[PDB]
From a paper:
FAN1 (FANCD2-FANCI-associated nuclease 1) is a DNA structure-dependent nuclease ubiquitously expressed in the central nervous system and peripheral tissues that plays a role in resolving interstrand crosslinks at replication forks. It possesses both 5′ flap endonuclease and 5′-3′ exonuclease activities, allowing it to process DNA structures that arise during replication stress and repair pathways. FAN1 comprises a DNA-binding SAF-A/B, Acinus and PIAS (SAP) domain, a tetratricopeptide repeat (TPR) domain that mediates dimerization and protein-protein interactions, a virus-type replication-repair nuclease module (VRR) containing the catalytic site, and an unstructured N-terminal region. PCNA is a homotrimeric ring-shaped DNA clamp that encircles double-stranded DNA after being loaded by replication factor C (RFC).
For the structural studies, we chose the canonical double flap DNA substrate over a CAG extrahelical extrusion containing DNA, because the 5′ phosphate of the post-nick strand is essential for tight coordination of the DNA to the NUC domain. This reduces the flexibility of this domain, resulting in more rigid particles and thereby enabling higher resolution structures. Indeed, the structural analysis revealed side-chain densities for the amino acids R706, H742, R952, R955, K986 in the NUC domain coordinating the 5′-phosphate. However, despite the high-resolution of the SAP domain, the flexibility of the dimerization loop prevented us from resolving R507. We solved the cryo-EM structure of the full-length FAN1–DNA complex and found that the flexibility of the 510-519 loop hindered our ability to again resolve the R507 residue. The unresolved loop region of FAN1 in the FAN1–DNA complex (middle). Additional structural comparisons between the FAN1–DNA and FAN1–PCNA–DNA complexes revealed that the angle of the 5′ flap double-stranded DNA substrate remains fixed at 68°, and no significant conformational changes were observed in FAN1 between the two complexes. F Overall structural comparison between FAN1–PCNA–DNA (gray) and FAN1–DNA (black) complexes reveals no significant conformational changes in FAN1 upon binding to PCNA.
Residue numbers in the entry: 372 to 506, 519 to 555, 576 to 784, 813 to 1007
Write the structure that this text describes.
Amino acid sequence: HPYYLRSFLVVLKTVLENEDDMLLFDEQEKGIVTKFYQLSATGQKLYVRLFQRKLSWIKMTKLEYEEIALDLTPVIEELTNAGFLQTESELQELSEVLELLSAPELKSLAKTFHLVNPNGQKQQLVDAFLKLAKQIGAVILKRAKALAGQSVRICKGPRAVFSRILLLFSLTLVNLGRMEFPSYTINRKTHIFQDRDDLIRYAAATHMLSDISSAMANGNWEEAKELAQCAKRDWNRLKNHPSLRCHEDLPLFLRCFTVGWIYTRILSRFVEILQRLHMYEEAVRELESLLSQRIYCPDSRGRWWDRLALNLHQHLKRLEPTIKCITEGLADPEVRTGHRLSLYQRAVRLRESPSCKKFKHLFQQLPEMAVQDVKHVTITGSVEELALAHYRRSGFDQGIHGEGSTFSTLYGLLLWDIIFMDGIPDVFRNACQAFPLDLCTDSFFTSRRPALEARLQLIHDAPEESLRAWVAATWHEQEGRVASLVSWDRFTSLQQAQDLVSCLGGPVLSGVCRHLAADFRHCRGGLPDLVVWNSQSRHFKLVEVKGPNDRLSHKQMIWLAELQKLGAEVEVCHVV
DNA sequence: CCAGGTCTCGTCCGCGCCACTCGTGTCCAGCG
DNA sequence: GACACGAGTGGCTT
DNA sequence: TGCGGACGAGACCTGGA
């Protein structure tokens, strides 16, 4: 079987094997799945290939895939009987015929009925024939279909079922069959989706969010704004619908996969575009409304407070609301790492600024958390490779451009037993899960608290050999197994990881792992990019490399201060 | 004492799967 | 009529 | 969300006065 068919079959079997997931699908949808199974291998390959393509008609001349078959003409018939593909006979909607027609063939069609400018843009000509059809339409359609040829569209019905299956799988695509996943007991005690309609709703919400992200990428913002507006209108409805209340009681990691969560991320994208369209007052209204709920996306409350403060300060030029927003944001426990530092820095800059005296300062009430200053080194001399070269010139001999993946890899290696341990409900729902589902959530440290603290303390008091024994044992058992935390390409060899942990030492590594385990989402970003060590000296310098243009991020400063606190010498290498 | 150039911090913005084949918009030199 | 560039979408991606 | 590029606004001095 080819790669795409293997991946699709893996997804299909994964969704089949979970009984709760198939509780969602109706009888005819399971019939469609079985119909897919009772097809030729060539037919399955063809349908997967068309599934990767967009839901538009494809000219039969363009469709040919030599590997699936020398000739696709029968396979098309086979899929046609089952209801998977609709051949030319169903092409009764004229707009898609025009889109199917090639532009030179558009010119030919305009010649056939030259009631309109012969030449021009494809969109313009298509609008022209569409107007012409409205004002003879049967003959126009007949000639259009005749000149187009034979085309096959992936039927909406079956494609919807396979799309929901893919959504369920990726919820928890080229190398899917080849990559093997780690060993862990599959245990789901709650249902991410309660009813089939709920998955339909989740599919609709994710489709809307994907449309808004496509508008993000294309740079089109007005359509993005109206899409976000209708999304907000939709989420204004269905709020009273009992489905949401059941979804609230869900754990945070499982609540991530809910209609409300996707609509809240859509609202966040609306905040981003509103700032992009410079409708800053509306962005402030949305951000204040976003923080009015504690239920959905508590993880992103930091960006909401930071953006609210920045909007009220430098883009609405109001100080009194800014003081309140900074104080409230620092008061919310959910803010971590960079955003807390950003709000603090805003508060301190306002404190030692003119025109802030007018009101009671309220920063006397505000806590004073100060990032420890880190040593800054500037070398003159691909900037990160240059920094590696400069440190190689120093006493240090080796180093790895971790970019935060090195600490994630070490943490995953040294805590793999706890990361994938059993006895935790719903944190592994499918046989295909690269990472435990409760990771990137505060529930990770709480649920695993005894063993997590035990292993973290052990690493804290671990001799270098014990860390090396643990890293060696875990790597041998799990090399290759998929894991979001562990990047196997990140370390050249297991000996490299052994040398790294031993050089880093048990305490500072234990602290880094503790921070990554308490809240991985906020602590993962901002780690120093470059870690350098000398094998003989066993001395390490963790270096965050920032070019002349870019300055230290708030997360980077927080992590550098924390790493210096743990006993690591950290400097920021500027290469000018 | 006043500058006008410079700095530096704060902020916005584009992308956030990649080169790759192929249908397209336009114009551009001739063409009548 | 060609047209020759770029751009863009779409497809494929072990 | 994390980058790496941009912009500009207030400081700010010092050359010149």
